[PDB]
């Protein structure tokens, strides 16, 4: 039986999607992710702020089909490091992804199975192409929420494990009032 | 070898993607698409207007990779029928598509291989899920350009022929100042 086509309203101001399933990631949910463990533990104990929320509209895992989701990435820093999404590779490594930036100032960090990294800046209107085999993470480098829509293959799945253990070969920090992408000492 | 990640600017007011492949379809490229053949002949002679332009960023046709494109669908009528895109099924029938409406007033007409139809209104912010197996055509029901962004599997391909010969089982016309979706009499 064919699936029913539908339309859902996406609010470009809030990132809210009608009919989507919500996910909330708090700072506590990201242990071992930031370089400055002291600032992390401090921020968690003090307020454990929400780092980001995802509104996902997903299908059964089937070749050729597509999922889409917005993310609202809140502004913040853990020590010198800007708030970011956990980041992942796809379970089916060769699945690509397309991001559309809607609001705020941010960017995407990407890296290969081997660690070679790239940084792509994102402002409203920017569409980012995430090629097959690249892990990807988004970072809010500004003062307001960074909101974007992502469209990805239904069967792409997720590999958070690799990233959670080694992180990205680079980190994005504020140094002298400036955003800088630098080597991860933890790597 | 890994492909290079990249970002491109999409302009939400004009639908133009900087550096993208541009395609232009004029009414003369749409012989046998509109119900009112005489009105089609007449409008082509008087003016041969651009019905739509597409700005496409495509990858090689491999499983799991993704293409994206904007379309600028111009306002107009052929007789009583609103300007529309040619419409197609995918070559790999079971490939889905996701559409994001950016500007203007329109909608999508979809139908199964058996001719069952569905109409989904589109205003700015509407995201439409085009399921596996469903042919899809966009229609402009207002007086300004209807602009939207579409993301689709790189291997989906196109099947235009099926629609080129028999059309869609429904049409979208203006009747008594109102938009109406009704049976295609030539189907
Ligand atoms: O599909 C995606 O890759 C995004 O929707 C991310 O899942 C989302 O931004 C949250 O990031 P992560 O999944 O890395 O926690
Ligand atoms: O991926 C899509 O289906 C869209 O980009 C359409 O191709 C585009 O709107 C043009 O319509 P058609 O391809 O039916 O002429
Ligand atoms: Ni992903
Ligand atoms: Ni299509």
UniProtKB/Swiss-Prot annotation, chains A, B:
Task: Tell me which InterPro entries the record gives.
Answer: G6P_isomerase_archaea/bacteria (IPR016758), G6P_isomerase_prok (IPR010551), GPI/OXD (IPR051610), RmlC-like_jellyroll (IPR014710), RmlC_Cupin_sf (IPR011051)
Give one Pfam hit by family name.
GPI
Q: Which pathway does it operate in? A: Carbohydrate degradation; glycolysis; D-glyceraldehyde 3-phosphate and glycerone phosphate from D-glucose: step 2/4
Taxonomic superkingdom: Archaea
- Please state how the activity of this protein depends on pH: Optimum pH is 7.0.
Which subcellular locations apply to this protein? Cytoplasm
Disulfide bonding pattern of the chain: none
- Activity regulation behaviour: Inhibited by mannose 6-phosphate, fructose 1-phosphate and fructose 1,6-bisphosphate.
This enzyme catalyses: alpha-D-glucose 6-phosphate = beta-D-fructose 6-phosphate
Q: Does the keyword DNA-binding apply?
A: no
Keyword vocabulary terms for this entry: Cytoplasm, Gluconeogenesis, Glycolysis, Iron, Isomerase, Metal-binding
Q: Name one GO biological process term.
A: glycolytic process
CDD domains, per the entry: cupin_PGI
**EC code(s) of this entry:** 5.3.1.9
So what family is this one in? Belongs to the archaeal-type GPI family.
> What binding partners and quaternary form does the record give?
Homodimer.
- Name listed for the protein in its UniProt record: Glucose-6-phosphate isomerase
Gene that produces this protein: pgiA
């Amino acid at each position: 039986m064919y699936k029913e086509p539908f339309g859902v309203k996406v609010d470009f101001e809030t990132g809210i999607i009608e009919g989507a399933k919500k996910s909330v990631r708090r700072l506590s949910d990201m242990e071992g992710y930031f370089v400055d463990e002291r600032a992390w533990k401090e921020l968690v104990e003090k307020e454990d702020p929400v780092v980001y929320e995802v509104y996902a509209v997903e299908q059964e895992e089937k070749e050729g089909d597509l999922n889409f989701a917005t993310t609202v990435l809140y502004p913040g820093k853990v020590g010198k490091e800007f708030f970011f999404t956990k980041g992942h590779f796809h379970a089916k490594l060769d699945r690509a992804e397309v991001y559309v930036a809607l609001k705020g100032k941010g960017g995407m960090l990407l890296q290969t199975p081997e660690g070679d990294a790239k940084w792509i800046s994102m402002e409203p209107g920017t569409v980012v192409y995430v090629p097959p085999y690249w892990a990807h993470r988004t970072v809010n480098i500004g003062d307001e929420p960074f909101i974007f829509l992502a469209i990805y293959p239904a069967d792409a799945g997720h590999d958070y494990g690799t990233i959670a253990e080694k992180g990205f070969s680079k980190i994005v920090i504020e140094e002298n009032g400036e955003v800088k992408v630098v080597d991860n000492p933890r790597w």
